[PDB]
């Protein structure tokens, strides 16, 4: 039938960036006319594929990754980027083929007093490889003393909360991000425009 892009975009709740959700799109026709011709998107950037030509292509599978970050971190969802989100939360490959979509969600994901449901990984020993999902809550060892699972000096919880408030600046307001990855394998294609 029709690929369920509405389930991903118009979802009541989104996931934290460290626990980003992934939807597998296959065996359906994907009409992107609603997406790239919608004025409710702050960012719509495609890499290696033109958005207009998308309806004239066919791919083996499509992956729709969805999460929430702040506005200043939207640029980190791009190939070759660095930063806390790009290094420890969500990393795109250098040969990324697909589109990145992001829109402001201050009306949905923010409340007076702070929304603390959305988290991001702040500490990690090594950077994330592309499309890696790290939900570990092990205490980060910033020193030479083993932490043994108890917080303390040089032993910090890897996750932090955004604490979205509607009074925050646009750079600290919540943005919902959807990453469409079009994978190309030597297999029959099940997604077309």
């Amino acid at each position: 039938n029709l690929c369920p892009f509405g389930e991903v975009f118009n979802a009541t709740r989104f996931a934290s960036v460290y626990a980003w959700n992934r939807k597998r799109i296959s065996n359906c026709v994907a009409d992107y006319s609603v997406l790239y011709n919608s004025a409710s998107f702050s960012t719509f950037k495609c890499y290696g594929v033109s958005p207009t030509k998308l309806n004239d292509l066919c791919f083996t599978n499509v992956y729709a990754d969805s999460f929430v970050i702040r506005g200043d971190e939207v640029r980190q969802i791009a190939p070759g980027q660095t930063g806390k989100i790009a290094d420890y939360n969500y990393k795109l490959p250098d040969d990324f083929t697909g589109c990145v979509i992001a829109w402001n969600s201050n009306n949905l994901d923010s409340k007076v007093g702070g929304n603390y449901n959305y988290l991001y990984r702040l500490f990690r020993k090594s950077n994330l490889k592309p499309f890696e999902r790290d939900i570990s809550t092990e205490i980060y060892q910033a020193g030479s003393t083993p932490c043994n699972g108890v917080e303390g000096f040089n032993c910090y919880f890897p996750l932090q909360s955004y604490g979205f408030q509607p009074t925050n600046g646009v750079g600290y307001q919540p943005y919902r991000v959807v990453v469409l990855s079009f994978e190309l394998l030597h297999a029959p294609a099940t997604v077309c425009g």
Partner: antibody
Framework: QVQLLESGGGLVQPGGSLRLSCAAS????????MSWVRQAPGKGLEWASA????????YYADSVEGRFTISRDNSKNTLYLQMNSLRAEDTAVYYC??????????????????????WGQGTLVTVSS | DIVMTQSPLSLPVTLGQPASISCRSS???????????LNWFQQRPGQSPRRLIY???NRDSGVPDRFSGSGSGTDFTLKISRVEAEDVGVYYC?????????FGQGTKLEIKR
């Protein structure tokens, strides 16, 4: 209107145990973090414990860590504070407080920051022989 | 732990004149998102504390306009425009940015008539 009614206070000998209940109403209980704050006679406030909305994450003050355990029943809309191995310094008026912040299923306590929306009437516990 | 000092510990004031309460933090209260989580509480005898001001300058619902808050970083001040009879009680500043949540010593606002 949001209401927080507290119960379980009374007299207890040192080393004893008792559980306090905080019946909350007027809001989505599972959506907000709840806390227990104590105030000794003639002393200022002192945070004692707190839970996330879902109940998975708990925090305790250094004075109370290991001694007290804090729990929550979202179905009953009730907050619980189990006090064990009580000592004389624990004698205080205990309040349950709802935070203005938005916590719950995928949130963590100790990662939140803000202030208490509303406070209960407060219940007094005395520890003496 | 962030320790906060209130000044004065006792604040006598006459009816109708302004009153000022100072709260100083041992550590900067600003956070990454440029938000400062300082709160002001009023506690009447035998009653639960009620939050007058949240985030330095924002007043809670039901708080009269006589109360105002100011400050930044480590130094903050609570201002009462004209003290009324109901304003008697103990006022606390609380630190919400970092656990553990700490409180000031509390100032006793008593009125003279």
């Amino acid at each position: 209107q949001v209401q927080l009614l507290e119960s379980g206070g009374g007299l207890v000998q040192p080393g004893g145990s008792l559980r306090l209940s905080c019946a909350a109403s007027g809001f989505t209980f599972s959506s907000y973090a709840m806390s227990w704050v104590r105030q000794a006679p003639g002393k200022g406030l002192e945070w004692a414990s707190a839970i996330s909305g879902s109940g998975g994450s708990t925090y305790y003050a250094d004075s109370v860590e290991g001694r007290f355990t804090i729990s929550r029943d979202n179905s009953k809309n009730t907050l619980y504070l189990q006090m064990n191995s009580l000592r004389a310094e624990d004698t205080a008026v205990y309040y349950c407080a709802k935070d203005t912040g938005y916590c719950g299923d995928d949130c963590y306590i100790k990662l939140i920051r803000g202030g208490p929306d509303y406070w209960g009437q407060g219940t007094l516990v005395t520890v003496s022989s | 732990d962030i320790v906060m000092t209130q000044s004065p510990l006792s604040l006598p004031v006459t009816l109708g004149q302004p009153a000022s309460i100072s709260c100083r933090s041992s550590q900067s209260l600003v956070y990454s998102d440029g938000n400062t989580f300082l709160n002001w509480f009023q506690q009447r005898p035998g009653q639960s504390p009620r939050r007058l001001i949240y985030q330095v300058s924002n007043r809670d619902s039901g708080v009269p306009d006589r109360f105002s808050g100011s400050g930044s970083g480590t130094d903050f001040t609570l201002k009462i425009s004209r003290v009324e009879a109901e304003d008697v009680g103990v006022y606390y500043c609380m630190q919400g940015t970092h656990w553990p949540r700490t409180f000031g010593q509390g100032t006793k606002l008593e009125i003279k008539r």
